A paper describes a structure:
Nicotinamide N-methyltransferase (NNMT) is a cytosolic enzyme that catalyzes the N-methylation of nicotinamide by transferring a methyl group from S-adenosyl-L-methionine (SAM) to nicotinamide (NA) resulting in the formation of 1-methyl-nicotinamide (MNA) and S-adenosyl-L-homocysteine (SAH). NNMT is implicated in various disease conditions such as metabolic disorders, neurodegenerative diseases and cancer, and tissue NNMT expression or plasma levels of its product MNA have been proposed as biomarkers for these conditions. Human and mouse NNMT proteins are very similar in size, consisting both of 264 amino acid residues. The biologically active unit is a monomer.
Author numbering: 5 to 260
The structure:
């Protein structure tokens, strides 16, 4: 199983962004999943009462799409990944560097969903002001953020991170409990991940994935001390050359 250090030395942020998040008009599997991720988040953060002062995004990678709806609903976002190369790609964008990945076709899509109340430039600006800290995280540690002191969070969001970081169910469950330690009682956990997936590809590089179904996922969440508010399974897969998943899931849970 892909160890922590394989992420340090072989996860190329740029390549990853190119292969999954380019969001072209050709209706490929990777674009379809992205559309569904965005609609989920929109529905979670805008249409439901999922709001508060602080959101901690766990395993952001070099991607910022997952925070476009969330910035409307949280005054402060803290982003975290285990890999500095990913935090640097993400900082390129937060500092609006001309060499940052083009997110604009994704930014326009999220503006659409919310009835174009805001223009692109203002959607982007709002997110940049929401992101207060960019931190090293490690879901396997019982203090995932290590030394860094944060107040209790209103929400923890993790997208396609947990299947990647955890080699087994004990580890997956402990991670969820580890993540729980950053949460207010009654606070929100939001996860979306691949179903029954044992690998994903970035260019030439293969990356291990923990293949779990809806039953294991849900049981691991409940066991970790969460109460499941809702849970959704979708059939849509990645391209067969890219991952071997049967689908994806979303859940919103509350801490006890
Ligand atoms: N032990 C660990 N703790 C925290 N993050 C980890 C981790 N092991 C792997 N990761 C991170 O999990 C991420 C999976 S790539 C997914 C990134 C992003 N959320 C997206 O939706 O595209 C990688 O960025 C990697 O750094
Ligand atoms: C597009 O990014 C991802 C796709 C599929 C993954 C999986 N575990 O199947 C993980 N992952 C990070």
């Amino acid at each position: 199983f892909t160890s922590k250090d394989t992420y340090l030395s072989h996860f190329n942020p740029r390549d990853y962004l190119e292969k999954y998040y380019k969001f072209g008009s050709r209706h490929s599997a990777e674009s379809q999943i992205l559309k569904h991720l965005l609609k989920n988040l929109f529905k979670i953060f805008c249409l439901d009462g999922v709001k508060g002062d602080l959101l901690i995004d766990i395993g952001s990678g070099p991607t910022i799409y997952q925070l476009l709806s969330a910035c409307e609903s949280f005054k402060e976002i803290v982003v975290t990944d285990y890999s500095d190369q990913n935090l640097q790609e993400l900082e390129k964008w937060l500092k609006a560097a001309p060499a940052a990945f083009d997110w604009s076709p994704v930014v326009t899509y999220v503006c659409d969903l919310e009835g174009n109340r805001v223009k692109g430039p203002e959607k982007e600006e709002k997110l940049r002001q929401a992101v207060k800290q960019v931190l090293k995280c490690d879901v396997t540690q019982s203090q995932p953020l290590g030394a860094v002191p944060l107040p209790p969070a209103d929400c923890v969001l993790s997208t396609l991170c947990l299947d990647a970081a955890c080699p087994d169910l004990p580890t997956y469950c402990r991670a969820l409990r580890n993540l729980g330690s950053l949460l207010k009682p009654g606070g929100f956990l939001v996860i979306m991940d691949a179903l029954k997936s044992s690998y994903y590809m970035i260019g030439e590089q293969k990356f291990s994935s923990l293949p779990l179904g809806r039953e294991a996922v849900e049981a691991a969440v409940k066991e970790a001390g969460y109460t499941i508010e809702w849970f959704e399974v979708i059939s849509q897969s990645y391209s067969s050359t890219m991952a071997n998943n049967e689908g994806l899931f979303s859940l919103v849970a509350r801490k006890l």
